[PDB]
């Protein structure tokens, strides 16, 4: 086992590949504390299930097998080249490779990519996955009801022949290749589409297919005999089989992982506290551990619709009075609490910049003079009473640190815990819940659904992205027409450097509003057993790229 033999070294899989190999064979033994959310490629949102989807299904574009920056740029997979952009970023054309096959030996055609995209529109039958494609492809004057309610194709998606697909968007969208790399755009042939039941027998265009799924118990993958290695620039497809054990307690999982009973943790939520201690303090175990950024941001939102948070000076007071050390310590410091940040973008993104509008003093513990001055400006010099919304666990400990921080300047906060299961949907994520319970501050964590500035920031701050019926991620309900207009400009800007500059302007404007208080970029500790080959943290996921892995002989 790993505790008795040294590994590649601390962080060896962060920005590089550990134990490179082309050796095929063996069974990759994976573990997760949770079952998949779905085996329908359109109905998944879990990051680790998206990783699993790289074994099961190909897409037009896919993130390349690359530990460096280029891993963030979608590469041709089923398509012969990247999307060809015409009409100002409004029309995207792809050409499909010829002769490709599903696991049942039937052909992949452009009709199947159109069908997959159409399926997304059937939210009454196929909820659970990303819906970015809907506003880009739906005609508001002639709405598309999905492929079960009409057999007329979506008018914005053309298939001039079996190997060509054309997407006619409602507006420019610079990041369209990224949407083609999401699993909901993996082809689904209509002939095999059993709708609500698709996850029970999905077709596979990837190097593996589902052999057995027992809910809460196991998922076994075997090779897809019709996948063609010569046609796949992404996937080495090394193991003969992949076996996922499901449902273990998270500490039980760490223990058995470190003991060698499983090879890798697919779920990828990192070592829990006990194993984090064990692993980071033992010389041999550190050699088997990577500590990447996950690209998640932990932050507090302030909601102008909840008095007195409508006043920019109240919001700035909170920013100045935040004890950044105490808050990081609540989330795992002094040594394991993520990476301190004063701005929003993760350093994976081109726009990432120095921005600290509200510095918290030479010790980062709060500038209380600045905070009090802001409170005087708000006409509340002695403070005020407010409520912070959170959920039990780590979010609660962070809320407590906020309470303690702000008490120093007379802002008296009461904590309101919301239902854990629905926190992101019906709790923090519902504008009516937030108003009903007076949640002027909210504690949350956010990861982009694709590794770009738009994917990361638009859902958090774009006025058009306020979700009035739940699942809202623009928590302050910021609707600044200048912010919105800048975002629009990025979407039709072809030059990546001009785009970065525009996004720097958006971020600065968002911080001027002071509605988001960034706390840390999250970090995690992944453990890798030394006999696993090709282990690397995928910069697009913050998790190991499962599909690239093999087994040493």
């Amino acid at each position: 086992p790993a505790p008795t033999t040294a590994g590649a070294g601390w962080d060896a899989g962060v920005g590089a590949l550990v134990n490179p190999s082309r050796r095929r064979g063996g069974t990759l033994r994976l573990v997760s504390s949770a079952d998949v959310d779905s085996l329908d490629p359109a109905r998944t949102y879990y990051v680790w299930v998206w990783l699993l989807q790289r074994l099961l299904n190909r897409t037009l574009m896919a993130y390349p097998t690359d530990p460096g920056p280029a891993g963030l740029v979608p590469a041709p997979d089923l398509a012969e080249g990247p999307g060809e952009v015409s009409d100002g970023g409004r029309t995207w054309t792809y050409r499909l490779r010829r002769g490709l096959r599903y696991d049942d030996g039937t052909p992949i055609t452009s009709d199947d990519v159109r069908h997959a995209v159409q399926r997304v529109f059937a939210q009454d039958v196929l909820p659970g996955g990303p819906t970015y494609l809907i506003p880009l492809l739906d005609d508001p004057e002639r709405p598309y009801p999905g492929p079960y309610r009409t057999d007329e194709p979506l008018r914005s998606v053309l298939t001039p022949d079996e190997h060509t697909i054309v997407f006619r968007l409602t507006r420019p969208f610079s990041d369209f290749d990224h949407l083609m790399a999401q699993p909901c755009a993996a082809p689904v042939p209509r002939r095999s589409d059993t709708g609500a039941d698709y996850g029970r027998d999905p077709r596979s265009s990837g190097p593996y297919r589902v052999a057995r799924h027992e809910p809460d118990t196991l998922l076994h993958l075997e090779r897809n005999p019709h996948w063609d290695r010569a046609t796949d620039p992404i996937r080495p497809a090394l193991p003969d089989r992949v076996e996922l054990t499901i449902g273990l307690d998270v500490d039980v999982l760490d223990a058995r992982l470190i003991a060698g009973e499983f090879d890798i943790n697919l779920e990828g939520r990192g070592l829990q506290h006990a194993a984090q201690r064990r692993a980071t303090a033992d010389e041999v175990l550190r050699s088997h551990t990577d500590n990447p950024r996950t690209s998640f941001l932990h932050f507090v939102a302030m909601q102008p619709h909840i008095p007195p948070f409508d006043n920019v000076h109240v919001r700035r007071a909170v920013q100045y009075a935040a004890d950044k050390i105490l808050l990081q310590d609540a989330r795992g410091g002094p040594v394991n609490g993520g990476d301190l940040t004063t701005a929003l973008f993760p350093p994976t993104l081109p726009a990432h910049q120095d921005l600290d509008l509200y510095p918290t003093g030479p010790d980062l513990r709060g500038d209380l003079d600045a905070a009090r001055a802001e409170l005087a400006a708000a006409g509340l010099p002695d403070g005020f009473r407010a409520v912070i919304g959170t959920q039990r666990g780590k979010f609660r400990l962070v809320a407590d640190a906020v309470v303690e921080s702000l008490a120093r300047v007379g802002i008296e906060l009461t904590v309101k815990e919301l239902d854990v299961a629905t926190y992101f949907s019906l709790g923090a994520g519902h504008p009516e819940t937030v108003r009903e319970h007076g949640l002027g501050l909210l504690v949350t964590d956010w990861g982009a659904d694709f590794p770009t500035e738009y994917g990361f920031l638009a859902p958090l701050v774009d006025g058009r992205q306020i979700k009035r019926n739940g699942g809202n991620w623009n928590l302050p309900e910021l609707d600044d027409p200048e912010v919105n207009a800048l975002i629009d400009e990025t979407l039709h800007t072809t030059d990546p450097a001009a785009r970065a500059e525009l996004w720097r302007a958006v971020e600065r404007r968002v911080m001027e509003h002071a509605v988001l208080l960034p706390l840390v970029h999250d970090k995690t500790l992944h453990f890798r057993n030394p006999w696993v080959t090709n282990v690397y943290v995928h910069p697009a996921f913050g998790l190991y790229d499962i599909q690239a892995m093999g087994l040493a002989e």
Partner: peptide
């Protein structure tokens, strides 16, 4: 997306 999660 939101993060993972006695």
């Amino acid at each position: 997306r939101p993060p993972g999660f006695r």
